[PDB]
Design a protein around this ligand. Structure first.
Ligand SMILES: Nc1ccc(CC(=O)O)cc1
Ligand SMILES: [Cl-]
Length: 147
């Protein structure tokens, strides 16, 4: 009865069941809440040395490895989930995208405009829901669906 995209999983450290979405890479303890022409999303991008364009407003030459970029993404997700930091604040400070200046907001879009892994995650998110690490040719993203 699980919605499409979701599967049951088992915590290795605790043995508690949880749920994982293989389109958004989201994970949560609770059983998921069982298509819009357009969605609106914000994102936080962390680029790496294999990014299509290894440059951003933060850094002329982006040299961190993909594994280092994933570790940074994972740390931002932990702080957002703990409430220690707000998504909008981390995006303004640390996103390797020009949309950092707008708290990560990309505005609204339909299918056919974004890179495919980003588009698929954006449209599989519920309104208000955050993705896990999403990989594109630009880098690694945290995606927040706002509308
Ligand atoms: N700067 C930047 C990089 C990647 C994306 C997502 C996509 O292209 O699908 C959006 C903005
Ligand atoms: Cl929704």
């Amino acid at each position: 009865k699980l919605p499409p995209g979701w599967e049951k999983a088992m915590s290795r450290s605790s043995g508690r069941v949880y749920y994982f979405n293989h389109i958004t890479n989201a994970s949560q303890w609770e059983r998921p809440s069982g298509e819009p022409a357009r969605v609106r999303c914000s994102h936080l991008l962390v680029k790496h040395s294999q990014s299509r364009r290894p440059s951003s407003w933060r850094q002329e030459k982006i040299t961190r490895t993909k594994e280092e970029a994933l570790e940074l993404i994972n740390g931002y997700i932990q702080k957002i989930k703990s409430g220690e930091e707000d998504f909008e604040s981390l995006a303004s400070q640390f996103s390797d995208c020009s949309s950092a200046k707008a708290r990560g907001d990309l505005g609204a879009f339909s299918r056919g405009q974004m890179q495919k892994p980003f588009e698929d995650a954006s449209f599989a998110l519920r309104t208000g829901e955050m993705s896990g690490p999403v990989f594109t040719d630009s880098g690694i993203h945290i995606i927040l669906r706002t509308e």
